[PDB]
Design a protein around this ligand. Sequence first.
Ligand SMILES: CCCCCCCCCCCCCCCC
Ligand SMILES: CCCCCCCCCCCCCCCC
Ligand SMILES: CCCCCCCCCCCCCCCC
Ligand SMILES: [Ca+2]
Ligand SMILES: [Ca+2]
Lengths: 534, 219, 118, 59, 164
Amino acid sequence: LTVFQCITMEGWTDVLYWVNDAVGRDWPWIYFVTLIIIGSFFVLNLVLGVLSGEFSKEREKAKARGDFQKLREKQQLEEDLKGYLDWITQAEDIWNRFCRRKCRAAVKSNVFYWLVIFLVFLNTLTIASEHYNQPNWLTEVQDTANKALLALFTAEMLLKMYSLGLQAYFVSLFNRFDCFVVCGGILETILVETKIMSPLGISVLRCVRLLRIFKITRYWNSLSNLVASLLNSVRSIASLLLLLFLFIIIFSLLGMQLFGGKFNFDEMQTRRSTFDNFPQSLLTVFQILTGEDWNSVMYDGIMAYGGPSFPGMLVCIYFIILFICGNYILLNVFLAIAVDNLADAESLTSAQKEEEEEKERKKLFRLQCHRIVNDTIFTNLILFFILLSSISLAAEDPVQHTSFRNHILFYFDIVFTTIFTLEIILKMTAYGAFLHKGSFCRNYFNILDLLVVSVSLISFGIQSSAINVVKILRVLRVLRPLRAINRAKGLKHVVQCVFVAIRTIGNIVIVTTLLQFMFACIGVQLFKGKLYTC
Amino acid sequence: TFIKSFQALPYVALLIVMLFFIYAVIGMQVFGKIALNDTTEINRNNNFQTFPQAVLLLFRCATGEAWQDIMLACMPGKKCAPESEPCGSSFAVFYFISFYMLCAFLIINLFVAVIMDNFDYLTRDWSILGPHHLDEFKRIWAEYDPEAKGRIKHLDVVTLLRRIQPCPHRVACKRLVSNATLFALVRTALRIKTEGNLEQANEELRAIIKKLLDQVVPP
Amino acid sequence: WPELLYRSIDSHTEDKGPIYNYRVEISIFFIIYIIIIAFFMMNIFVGFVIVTFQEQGEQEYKNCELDKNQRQCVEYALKARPLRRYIPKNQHQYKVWYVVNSTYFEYLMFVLILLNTI
Amino acid sequence: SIVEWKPFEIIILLTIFANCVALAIYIPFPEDDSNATNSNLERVEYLFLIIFTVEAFLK
Amino acid sequence: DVVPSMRPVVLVGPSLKGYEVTDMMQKALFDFLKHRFEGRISITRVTADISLAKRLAEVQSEIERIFELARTLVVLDADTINHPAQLSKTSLAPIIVYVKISSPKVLQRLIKSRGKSQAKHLNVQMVAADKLAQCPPELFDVILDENQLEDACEHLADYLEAYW
Ligand SMILES: CCCCCCCCCCCCCCCC
Ligand SMILES: CCCCCCCCCCCCCCCC
Ligand SMILES: CCCCCCCCCCCCCCCC
Ligand SMILES: [Ca+2]
Ligand SMILES: [Ca+2]
């Protein structure tokens, strides 16, 4: 039971510290660290591998099921409706209605698009400006800004409504969503004026304003393809989520019949995560699924069913099965949804975008007797010096101010500063020195060698000052190990591939950050200081 | 196979070690002198005093183990340890949040790199023949033949361990007639093409695909 | 998480202390946030990294050539190498070799180790 | 048998849903306590028993 | 045979000209033709038949008056040509344009918006689109694939630079 408690990583460190307090701190960390690494990380890696790889099988079968091919059919379909309805839009106008051409012209113009983006920025700044005890004037500023932005947004919304065909306008998903958010804003105005608004109303309506903040991220396609695939798969998404919801209901209704109201102990009732009533049994089951304080709930159940004994304490079966099935059933549903759909979504960025690109294409100092020698053995030698320099500061004593070892490490620092400035002197001989077409400024990694050396040197320059300036210099001097990157031939490949991965992740990470900001704004609206407790 | 993949991607592991090292050192100097005390996260068992302890604390934070309380422990205003002749910075929030994101990202990166490296086997229907079939064929032949003692020497059908997965319609006899045995099985177990010219067609393939002795391949 | 959830459920009014289970509907906010952000979006991170690495690995897709199974097989075309068996020559050696190498001996030794762990 | 041709399985699944609802309301009081609702859910359970056993007999 | 000093321009639309939608596919289109070919292009409006040409009474002078405008050194618009066959009966060295809807599923959506009177008359309209999906490239010279006007309009001008 305890080893299994460590594999799930929850309550891990508690048993490690309890053991350390019994058999000393020296060796015991080995056991639990190896337990975590081996058990948790290898099993997690293997389950991810055998799901993702398996998910590729069902993806391959799906491609025969026309799942992706049919998706492209609904994309070009709706796409061409606007383009052809544009003709009628441009043909219905060949009472005088010559201003229609001008109003439509601004709609596609960059001036109006960037103006509306800026208005959205003001909208998000106003709501994001929330604050616990707002200055009294800021409340009026926020309210009047909300009124103003509402008036404008509805004005240009109607402008697009009449400038473009109403049917064509409603065809687009984004325009329908914008109509939804503006209607929510109208509701905001009416409810606030009539004073019949309710906390659910303020919550969901601040939410609709924040939705209107989705007007940002419109040009980009990577999120758009994900959204399109998600909308296509909704009828498939709802099945998995319905199944998981049914499973949580079952494992909550079972906990009610097992631990229903048996969590009454003479100890102080901090058992908030209890099984008493169904609305809270769900929260406890959800907590177990994510596995935050799984230990606490399992221990409470064990104690409820007697103490540690054979007839009791068998309850561990329920918690173990719940946790295993959960973090397996959750893993299947969520990886399936985030791989099959995303893999399909990513293929739109490669299927329709790629061919369309083709369609457009189809439509169309001293320099003499220098010594660069010895730069071969010095490769490994500099590697070794970097390694030992890194090890140097690690062994430093942080807690002893008048340290018996800091002066020794100061000697090592002096020696290694000399050694690592030798190659700084050398680099002048090689092409560079910010001259000779700037061969030195074409490899910033080479420059980064000086920066760390400079800070190391700069530490001594102000060291004699005995002043607080040098305090940060020591902290920053830790950049030494990275020097190996520029001196390593594979580590460079690894770090560059990692940066490429980051650049790829950019879209998803920014979408997650924006949606998290949405939820932060809603949370500010709900709990703006209602958490204090004496 | 998973262990072998880990061998082939050591620099990602070295990168993770570099992250741990840099962050352990940074935590060593800023949050070094925090006063140890029970009833708080920074205690005798977690602290940035000795490098092993700093690495252990950062590992604890990596496993998502109440790292938020550690963060709140290192936020400023904390009494400094007696060794000082107060301590605690406001840099903690950025330190721990950045560490969590970066360590999670590199752990994900290592996991998916190994998944990429083992993708071939992790995505294998086990229906088409695989190297396991070749290994069991090698073992049965070794039982039939000790070290490097097979050139033709064949007059029996004891090599019937081949099950339904590659004498049905005597195709086995025809395949036997048509390292040489392994090559013939490979080219014909898949049944790539049947036009009476695969040997010629393959004879024009091994030349471009290859290097080593090809005076036995044609047979 | 649960500490925050059960401190927020007890949120009565601005600048006032908590009340036991005042509004337990608030859990909808935390439930939705949990599922969407954590589960959905971090799993999207993992799936997106998987897809990107799969795409990068298939850079040398070489669709003109045939399956990769033949690739592995022909790269193994240097197989059929000697394998160490060393059938004992001495008959006294041969008896112990046969009894040791029989599957019965292996099964028995597995039972021994299993009982040892028990 | 021909009754199964008549789609009563819809009403049977609505009955299963009704029973699923009739279990969230059942509050499990600590030690034998029971309010009024818990004293009518036994009767509702008897009804569900009868309908399910009739369906089992038919099928 | 002999060019009428010009290559007359016609457009059959994606389906019958008898309804509003087909004309509107070209009503604005013709506007840009003269607005970017000042003096280089001329347009004509007729309502009679031109298929019956021997290279009805109104047809006799119809071919001449077109040739009268062709001798000025031209775009024709009618309701007779629903297929290049309707114009293949005469050899006037013409240029003919075709509006294409690659997905007939779009036809209903376009029809479903203008009016419910002809909404049930889609079968009348769509069959021509089918009829406009058979002629090989030879009778399918001018191509209108892209959707909006600006991208499509640029592909009209390029074919007009064959001679001028
Ligand atoms: C899933 C692991 C546990 C399942 C079996 C229950 C274990 C019960 C045996 C341990 C208790 C023995 C008596 C202890 C007396 C203090
Ligand atoms: C299915 C995932 C878990 C969902 C947990 C939240 C369920 C709803 C709880 C609140 C129900 C109403 C409470 C009583 C009336 C205010
Ligand atoms: C599917 C809709 C109906 C779901 C509810 C069916 C059972 C309701 C009966 C029990 C309700 C409590 C009444 C107890 C007397 C105060
Ligand atoms: Ca925890
Ligand atoms: Ca966790």
